[PDB]
């Protein structure tokens, strides 16, 4: 995927 | 993926 | 803010 | 705000 | 803010 | 991936 | 801020 | 990957 | 800030 | 990888 921002 | 920002 | 992931 | 994921 | 991941 | 900012 | 990863 | 900023 | 990884 | 900034 592209990714995750948390 | 691209990655993760936390 | 917290910020920005791009 | 919290922010922006793009 | 916290910052920016690009 | 590209990586991780924490 | 905390900073920037690019 | 590129790496990790913590 | 903390700083910058590029 | 490129590496790690902590």
Give the number of other Cβ atoms within 10 Å of residue D2's Cβ: 12
Q: Locate the chain F residue with the closest alpha carbon to H5.
A: F5
Residue pairs spanning A and B at CB distance below 8 A: 18
Residue I5 to residues A1, A3, D1, F3, Cα–Cα distance (Å): 22, 19, 24, 11
Residue B4 to residues D4, I1, Cα–Cα distance (Å): 13, 20
CA–CA gap between residue B6 and residue G2 (Å, rounded): 11
User: Could you tell me which residues come within 8 angstroms of residue C4 by beta carbon, excluding any fewer than 6 positions away?
Assistant: D3, D4, D5, D6, E4, E5, E6
Q: How far is H3 from chain J (nearest CA, A)?
A: 5
Residue A1 to residues G2, G3, H2, Cα–Cα distance (Å): 25, 24, 16
CA–CA gap between residue J5 and residue I5 (Å, rounded): 6
Residue with tokens 């990888």: J1
φ and ψ at residue B2, rounded to 5 degrees: -85, -55
Task: Confirm if E6 and G4 have CB atoms less than 8 A apart.
Answer: yes
> What are chain I's partners, defined as 3 or more CB pairs within 8 angstroms?
G
- Method used to determine the 3D structure: electron diffraction
Which is nearest to D4 in space by CA: H6, H4, B5? Answer: B5
């Amino acid at each position: 995927n592209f990714g995750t921002f948390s």
